[PDB]
Amino acid sequence: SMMKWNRERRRLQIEDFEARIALMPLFQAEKDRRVLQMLRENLEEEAIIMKDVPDWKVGESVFHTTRWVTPMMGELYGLRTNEEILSATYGFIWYT
C-alpha cells in the first residue's frame, strides 16, 4: 500500500512542478524590473547625497568588468527602512 500511495504522490508532485515551472518566467520578469527599478532609484538618491563630495564618480561599478552582476542584496537595500531590510534577508528564515 505504501508503494501505491507513494508513487501516486510522486505523480501529483511532478505535476506541481509543472505548475510552478509554468508560473516562473513572468516572476523572472517582475523581479527583473523591480531590481533595475530599485537600483535606479538608489542611484538617484546617490546623486543627491554624495553630490556634496567634491570627488566622487557616481554609480561607478567597482569592477573592470562590463558585465552585469546581479547586485548583492546589501547595496540594493542601501537606504531602506530597517523593517524593509528585516523583510529582505532574515525574512525567510525568521518566518515560521
Binding site: 508513487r7 510522486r10 505523480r11 508532485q13 511532478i14 512542478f17 515551472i21 516562473m24
Partner: protein, 82 residues
Amino acid sequence: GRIASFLKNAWAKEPVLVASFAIGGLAIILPSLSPYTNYAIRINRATPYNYPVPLRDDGNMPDVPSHPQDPQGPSLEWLKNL
C-alpha cells in the same frame, strides 16, 4: 551438510543475531534482481526542480518539440500507468 546443522544451533542460541544476518545480507543481494530499480532511477530523471531552458531553433533537429506540446519529446505516461 554439517554446516547446515549449526544453523540449528545458532538459531537455538542467538536468534536475534541470526535474523539480523538474514535480512541484513538479503537486503544487499536482492536489489539488483528487481526490475523496478531501473524505473526507480528513471523517476528521478522525470522530476525537474530546475527550469527547462529552451533551445534556439536551428534547422529541424527535430526531436525537440516546439511548443505547445509537440509530440516529439519524451513520453511520460508510462509513468502515469504506474
